Ligand binder design. Sequence first.
Ligand SMILES: [K+]
Ligand SMILES: [K+]
Ligand SMILES: [Mg+2]
Ligand SMILES: [Mg+2]
Ligand SMILES: [Mg+2]
Ligand SMILES: [Mg+2]
Ligand SMILES: [Mg+2]
Ligand SMILES: [Mg+2]
Ligand SMILES: [Mg+2]
Ligand SMILES: [Mg+2]
Ligand SMILES: [Mg+2]
Ligand SMILES: [Mg+2]
Ligand SMILES: [Mg+2]
Length: 59
Amino acid sequence: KYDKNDVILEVTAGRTTGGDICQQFTREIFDMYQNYSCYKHWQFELLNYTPADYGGLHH
RNA sequence: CCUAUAUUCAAUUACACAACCAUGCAAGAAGAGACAAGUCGUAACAAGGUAAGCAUACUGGAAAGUGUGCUUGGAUUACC
Ligand SMILES: [K+]
Ligand SMILES: [K+]
Ligand SMILES: [Mg+2]
Ligand SMILES: [Mg+2]
Ligand SMILES: [Mg+2]
Ligand SMILES: [Mg+2]
Ligand SMILES: [Mg+2]
Ligand SMILES: [Mg+2]
Ligand SMILES: [Mg+2]
Ligand SMILES: [Mg+2]
Ligand SMILES: [Mg+2]
Ligand SMILES: [Mg+2]
Ligand SMILES: [Mg+2]
């Protein structure tokens, strides 16, 4: 079923450790899927992008 | 009633009678604790950058802010 509906991918910053170790890691995997979409010839549409203070992605 | 002995007895009345408390459930309200790292600010510990704090009053998103009196669980480094 489905497989022909646009899918929204949401990434956040896990709350398990202090610092930016989790926030910085969020940026890397977010760009992983963005480059992956080009490999699969998909279409990427940015909806929300909130950078963190210490060079990261809050959500 | 010349030895002797037989028989009966009841429940009513005036008024109170779920107030009351226990247990269980509930439309819903409020508090406390928890890890965790999110948003907002930096109150406290150094004269914490306005010395802190108690009683009480008033005020503000939030720590708290300010007045009056009191405490040193602050200092004035000591022929200055
Ligand atoms: K103060
Ligand atoms: K002090
Ligand atoms: Mg922290
Ligand atoms: Mg000073
Ligand atoms: Mg301070
Ligand atoms: Mg200040
Ligand atoms: Mg102060
Ligand atoms: Mg004071
Ligand atoms: Mg007071
Ligand atoms: Mg004032
Ligand atoms: Mg005062
Ligand atoms: Mg004034
Ligand atoms: Mg001395």
